[PDB]
């Protein structure tokens, strides 16, 4: 959609080391524009490609039962010319491939808002104070650890003329924002208007999901200078390359669920919602949304006895037909069936091959471990608290 | 088969006086983007710095003569105008022999502004040192050059001088056969 | 060289790495010993053949093996079978490595395959047997090295000086040799001699072999390649391949049995019509129909043969021949299906997915 | 009626070719070289992340010697020691004094690697510049096996001599061992 | 027991070179702390076996005239009976012999301070940016040539929650930290404050030498493979060893005068804490203790004119009774004695046998060289003045 | 030999020892023997020299009287105790200098062990045998076999020559010691009851095996081959226990040898017998010295101090002041050179030395 945002980014950076604040302004907006218009265009054209060319399985084709040796072949040719098609519309429609890929400091430079600090300090100097505190606040929430942004923010907030509805982010999904301000409107007692907010947290949180799986099947990654020596089949490249690709789309479960104001990523999300969601109408007085969403998180959880404990509550004043004819959400059921199959793959793959996962999630059973590595993760767990202990130590004797 | 050519990028060199010539480079601008763009902006003088009296202080005796390392002549330096460094694109040609450039990198994607050249046929270097071009004339400066007396250091004591380094745009992209220079 | 083998019953003091036996006999050679060298070279052979039927071997308990089938609630998710399929021909692959003598130890590179597969240590082994007073072998090692390569210089000399001195006139053999060359040149021996039972006994036993053989050399050309680019996961899965059609594409132009120095054209249409008169002559018109039908599958453009079954439909209802006994034997229409698919996938693969970046001159 | 002594051993069970030939079986002297024999038990058991297991013996001369333990190229250049790249040489308190005692080999002054001997001959020339550090004391008809391999020209075995397992004993007690061959 | 160094220091590399931060922050910490009491072990073990079985000798024992036979033998099996039972608690003492061996590569690594640079690194990896700002200066003023770590460095000043006042060293002695700030503090034109920085400064350097005086008996140094013929006696042996050992117990005077930012050791180490001192305490208002450092510094050099006329300018505003009563300190006194006492010796050793001596001092009074040496070094001085006109008439006939 | 002395050695002799051994060998390979024993007696002559070289140093350097100190080192004992040892160093160097023997090739250490365990003897008496040289192979054998009396072959060639008759005036040492000559003289003399011509031999056997013994002590501080590298006093130390080891073995090889097992303490035993010749001759005041230094050196004995009662019954008769039971200072410094010894080493034996070999 337009030229690197690297090279726009050096550009900016060139001309504000000498004072040209148009120039720096007018460069880090055109790279804040390339590199969103430079994502969307790979979203839309992997999805349609997706989409317009399926997997056409064919169940229905039983090779043969006398003959061997040709039924291999066929099924072959037919599933890579289904690859094929696929591949030539990829190629054709995604365009050149130079301004798909930058170097990773730049990806490190492009997540901590740096050009918000560059626009920042140029609104300032051209007497832009709105675009100034729209992009000082959104550094600020960037990166938490800076005081001295807090007193430029003071700084900017005693000149006269700014709004408070101009304190605006820009920068964060909406799924997190709409979730947070819902939990803090919740926590101080008003349940009439903390409904919408968790609604919408749904919803744009399962499209996040979808947008979010279709952009790590990306290019495999080597062991340095070890792609020399690589000496791998043909039906062994496509599984390594499947399992990593596998292992993004799993591990895009823990990134949704990070602010950069909190240090850990969140802990339950998703249940955490329906949970809210339920206490939520509860309080409000619609009931048969309070038992919905209890048993849609029971479903998640089936071990828990306070939410059990709920549920009696909540089925016990309404009516039991009512409460036996509600069932759990259906979105909830896909999301929760496609990452168990994934998982069941991921762990065969370990068990068999030695490629290493770590679980994202808490809600996986046992059934889908296999009884052979848990050993040597309670061992590595093991190894893990004996080294924070060390170090507490280290950090005791150095006082 | 061959790969294609698309633009041509001359220097024009001089031993302190007295200049030796001109070296006319063919850029692979359709195998490899990404690193002919970076060399002809960095030659041309668009962004301000450039190539323009640069040095080449690596002068090893038929081995290699590095150099464009245009901030200091160290031979430690050098920022592209893809903000300071770049990632390889892809190796799809190899070393083969005398005239056969390349980029210089300190480690995995640390691709920089300076310069490669060969004058025997290196086989250990494949696989590690992207290549984007393949000189056409002037292979005689080059040889002339190479011969020059250096300390143990391999720096010249004769101080090599880029006069000029312009751009020449080619009107049909075609391609050379891969034996050398 | 090739007659004390067995692929499956291999001497265990002749198993060592096929580097190191090629460079140890390479060096024994450089130093005039010619008896070691010779030695050591027939066993590189022999251990190079070893590794290429291991290979074509362990390729075919993967493909050609039941799998089992999920319930439905993995049936509705094509993207995860398909993927969990190859998944699982990986491991029985890896599985079904380990436990061969030729796997366990140290592997060749790619270049010293390339050179085994040029038939260029052949050129050493006809000197070597002049140097040991071998003449038939050495003629034989020379003509089997020419028959690759009919373009050399310094060979044709070679073999001019072989061919000059008396002796050594009717050995004219290949060493490089398969079942089906033999087996068809016996068959048309026999068949010009008019002797016909022979003649259908030998192209029946030679159907099977052919088949089996390209099928193999089909299904042993899912190689390795070199890392020259880095992209993305469709177009790094589709581009493997390509290599591969290239690979499986010039499969069958290797195969064709050479006969006075000219290749046989169109070799399975051919059989086919040597088994159909041969049926023929005999009046046993039963199983000569599916034959002609056969022929005209594989070569739809013919006139002698268009005309015999003009003949065969005029008279259809007077041996009690029926239309079912009129379609093609599986095995033909199979071999036909293969080869039509994977020649229109490469024309579909030269004007896509192939860069336009390579110029001739 | 002297000896030094044995205070650990380190085992040994290898691979020519395709076949099995059986368990060598050294006893280290930890009293004298404490050092060269942590380190060489550190990488036998190989519990530090690299180790002996799947190397192999690069070097065979005929009644002179047998030399291995390189796993990092294999050719007879690499080998990196649990103490960094080389450490210095300990002490020379024991010599050479025929077949079966195994010492240390360096490429120059105190630049001991990851690479032994198992000497064959007496080998008196040698007493003096590398750091005898055990005795194989159970099993020596697997290095008469192993020496006689046929080898190439840089003597390097034609075929693959590998140590297929290595690990460790513990002695509960030292024990002295006589100063005689084998 | 204490791990050796450069094994922690090799596991901690590979750790970093692995990936994982606690590991080898944990490591290098170790290593730096196991180095350090391990030097200390030597040292304590060292002084006190050697302080505890004195040298006296017997005052009893008398020359023997009418035998001359037995009084050899009694007298050594007499001194060589101390030698053992000193040997004897040295050997118990001290503990296992391996630890305190380490190669070549291990201790000039260890001189550059690169545990430092993990450290640092991994401190800000792991968010404890005070502890990576402490490692980044210490690692700074180690190496004067790294301005990547002087970008690192302005970077966590300009960095949140780095203050001025947590910039330590940790790795320089004190005799080294407090002269220079003496001598910068006393550049400024304070010397109120610029006496008791050297008052410290003297004390520390008096320590460090009888410190690390005892850490110079060390095994012989053999050259290459020298030590298969050396055949050298009971009584040469010891000679050669204890020659060797005061040689290196003599290069310990231009190992504490010089600094890792500093390119040549100070010129006049001790005298010029004294001169310094006489101007500060000239400036304050001390006339007592100002006469006392110029006569002190007149001990060691005989013909200096400035502190002369500086001690007959105060002799002249005190009383000649003052002067006449403060003598010079009684450490001047002492490291004055006995460092000529071992020139001496030192000087006759390489006369006679002929093992090399550089002087390592500059006020070694000119009677302690032989006739020979002195003979040597007359004629080196006259070929040198030789050397020199011949380059300036040669000079001259180029213009 | 008589054929040279110390101060009478030619000067075409003085040739390396190991090229004089190794033609000897030669010769001896080519049954030449007459080369081959003049070599051969050549290189026992020079060997011989070498080892009075040797001692002369080492006992000249020692003995040296100790020069005046300077005053100011009187306050740091080890730099005085080292810069005397660094004189005595200078000295010695000077000293081994001056003397010719050690102006050539010096042969290595295993030719000495070879000489030391007389391996020349055997090839010197075969050569004999070869050559019919009868008594000279008689008296070669005789001096071989004081270190290896076992040797089967050299007891058949023993039994052989005795059975020729006046095999007895061919039995001899080639290395005689004089001290041991005089000690049988004496012995001769006290069997003839000849008292006064005992007394001048006891007087010339005391002062020349004092010279021996100290001359073979002071001349064993040598080399060492180097298998550890140490710390200063650790290496010091270990290189005077082994030189301790060597030394600790003096009084035990100059022990005279008569009738095929050594005759214990010859020193007391001397003395008894010179307190027996006393009392038969009735000088009591000179027998009382040997009785006390017999005392010391022997205490064990309770016919000694029985003996001693009696004579203290009545010393007043005789007229003794005590002066007369004041041992002789030689006795006393032989005694306290040997308690040192045997309790240093003891000591370093103890608490020093490693333990890293075992037994069996
Ligand atoms: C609960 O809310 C749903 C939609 O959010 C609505 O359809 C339903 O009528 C509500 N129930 C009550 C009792 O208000
Ligand atoms: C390979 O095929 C044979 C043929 O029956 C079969 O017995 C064997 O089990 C197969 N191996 C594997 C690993 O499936
Ligand atoms: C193979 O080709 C034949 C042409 O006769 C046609 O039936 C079909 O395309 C293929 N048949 C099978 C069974 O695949
Ligand atoms: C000189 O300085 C010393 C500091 O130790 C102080 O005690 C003394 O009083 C000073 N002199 C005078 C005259 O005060
Ligand atoms: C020892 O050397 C000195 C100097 O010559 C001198 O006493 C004498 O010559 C030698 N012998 C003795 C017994 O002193
Ligand atoms: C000699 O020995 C006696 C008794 O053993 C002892 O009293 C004396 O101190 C020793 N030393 C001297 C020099 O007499």
Not at chain 3, 248 to 255: A, D, H, P
């Amino acid at each position: 959609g337009m030229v690197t945002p690297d090279l726009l980014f050096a550009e900016g950076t060139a001309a504000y080391a000498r004072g040209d604040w148009p120039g720096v302004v007018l460069s880090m907006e055109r790279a804040l524009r390339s590199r969103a218009a430079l994502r969307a265009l790979r979203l839309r054209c992997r999805t349609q490609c997706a989409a317009d060319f399926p997997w056409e399985l064919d169940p229905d084709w039983s090779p043969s039962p006398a003959q061997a040796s040709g039924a291999a072949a066929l099924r072959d040719l037919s599933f890579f010319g289904g690859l094929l098609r696929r591949a030539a519309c990829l190629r054709r429609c995604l365009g050149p491939p130079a301004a798909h890929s930058l170097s990773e400091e730049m990806e490190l430079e492009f997540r901590k808002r740096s050009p918000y600090n560059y626009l920042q300090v140029a609104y300032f100097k051209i007497n832009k104070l709105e675009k100034a505190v729209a992009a000082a606040h959104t550094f600020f929430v960037g990166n938490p650890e800076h005081m001295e942004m807090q007193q430029n923010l003071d700084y900017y907030q005693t000149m006269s003329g700014v709004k408070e509805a101009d304190f605006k982010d820009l920068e964060t999904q909406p799924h997190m924002q709409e979730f947070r301000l819902g939990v803090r409107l919740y926590s101080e007692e008003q349940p009439q208007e903390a409904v919408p907010h968790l609604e919408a947290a749904l919803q744009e949180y399962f499209v996040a999901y979808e947008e979010c799986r279709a952009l790590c099947e990306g290019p495999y990654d080597y062991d340095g200078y070890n792609y020399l020596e690589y000496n791998a089949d043909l039906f062994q490249a496509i599984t390594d390359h499947y399992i990593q690709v596998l292992n993004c789309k799993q591990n895009c479960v823990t990134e949704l669920a990070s602010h950069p104001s909190r240090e850990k990523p969140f802990e339950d999300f998703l249940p955490s919602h329906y949970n809210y969601l339920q206490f939520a109408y509860y309080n409000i007085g619609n009931y048969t949304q309070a038992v919905e969403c209890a048993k849609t998180y029971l479903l998640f959880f089936p071990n828990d006895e306070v939410m059990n404990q709920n549920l009696a509550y909540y089925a016990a004043m309404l009516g039991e037909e009512h409460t036996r004819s509600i069932g759990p959400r259906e979105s909830a059921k896909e999301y929760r069936q496609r990452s168990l199959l994934e998982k069941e793959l991921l762990f065969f793959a370990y068990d068999v091959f030695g490629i290493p996962f770590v679980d994202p999630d808490s809600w996986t059973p046992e059934e889908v471990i296999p009884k052979r590595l848990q050993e040597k993760q309670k061992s590595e767990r093991e190894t893990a608290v004996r080294i924070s202990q060390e170090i507490g130590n280290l950090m005791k004797e150095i006082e | 088969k061959g790969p294609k050519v698309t633009v041509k990028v001359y220097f024009d060199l001089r031993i302190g006086d007295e200049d030796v010539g001109r070296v006319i480079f063919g850029l692979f601008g359709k195998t490899v983007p990404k690193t002919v763009d970076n060399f002809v902006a960095l030659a041309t003088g668009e962004k301000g710095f450039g190539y323009k009296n640069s040095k080449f202080h690596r002068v090893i005796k038929d081995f290699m003569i590095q150099g464009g390392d245009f901030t200091r002549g160290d031979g430690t330096g050098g920022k592209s105008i893809y903000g300071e460094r770049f990632p390889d694109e892809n190796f799809k040609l190899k070393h083969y022999g005398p005239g056969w450039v390349s980029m210089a990198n300190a480690g995995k994607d640390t691709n920089g502004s300076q310069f490669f050249i060969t004058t025997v046929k290196t086989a250990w270097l494949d696989g590690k040192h992207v290549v984007f071009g393949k000189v056409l004339e002037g292979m005689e400066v080059v040889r002339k050059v190479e011969s020059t007396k250096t300390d143990s250091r391999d720096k010249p004591l004769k101080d090599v001088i880029i006069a000029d380094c312009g751009k020449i745009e080619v009107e049909k992209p075609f391609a050379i056969a891969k034996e050398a220079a | 060289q090739y007659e004390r083998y067995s692929f499956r019953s291999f001497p265990r003091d002749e198993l060592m790495p096929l580097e190191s036996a090629y460079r140890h006999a390479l060096d024994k050679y450089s130093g005039e010993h010619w008896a070691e060298s010779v030695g050591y070279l027939e066993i590189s052979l022999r251990l190079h053949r070893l590794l290429r039927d291991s290979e074509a071997f362990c390729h075919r308990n993967c493909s050609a093996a039941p799998q089992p089938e999920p319930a439905a609630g993995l049936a509705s998710y094509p993207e995860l079978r398909l993927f969990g399929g190859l998944l699982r021909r990986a491991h029985c692959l890896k599985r079904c490595k380990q436990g061969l003598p030729a796997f366990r130890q140290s592997q060749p590179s790619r270049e010293v395959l390339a050179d085994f597969q040029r038939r260029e240590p052949y050129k050493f082994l006809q000197f070597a047997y002049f140097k040991a007073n071998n003449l038939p072998k050495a003629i034989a090692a020379a003509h089997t090295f020419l028959l690759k390569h009919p373009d050399d210089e310094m060979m044709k000399r070679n073999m001019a000086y072989y061919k000059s001195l008396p002796g050594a006139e009717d050995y004219i053999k290949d060493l490089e040799t398969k079942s089906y060359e033999s087996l068809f040149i016996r068959a048309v021996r026999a068949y010009n001699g008019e002797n016909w039972r022979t003649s259908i006994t030998d192209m029946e036993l030679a159907l099977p072999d052919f088949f089996k053989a390209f099928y193999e050399c089909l299904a042993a050309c899912e190689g390795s390649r070199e890392i020259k680019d880095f992209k993305d996961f469709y177009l790094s899965i589709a581009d493997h391949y390509v290599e591969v059609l290239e690979c499986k594409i010039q499969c069958e132009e290797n195969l064709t049995p050479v006969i006075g120095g000219y290749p046989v054209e169109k070799f399975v249409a051919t059989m086919y019509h040597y088994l159909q008169f041969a049926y023929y002559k005999l009046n046993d018109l039963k199983n000569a129909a599916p034959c002609a039908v056969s022929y005209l599958l594989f070569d739809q453009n013919d006139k002698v043969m268009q005309q015999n079954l003009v003949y065969y439909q005029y008279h259809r209802d007077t041996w009690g021949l029926s239309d079912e006994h009129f379609q093609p034997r599986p095995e033909a229409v199979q071999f036909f299906n293969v080869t039509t698919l994977q020649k229109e996938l490469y024309d579909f693969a030269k004007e896509n997915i192939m860069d336009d970046d390579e110029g001739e001159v």
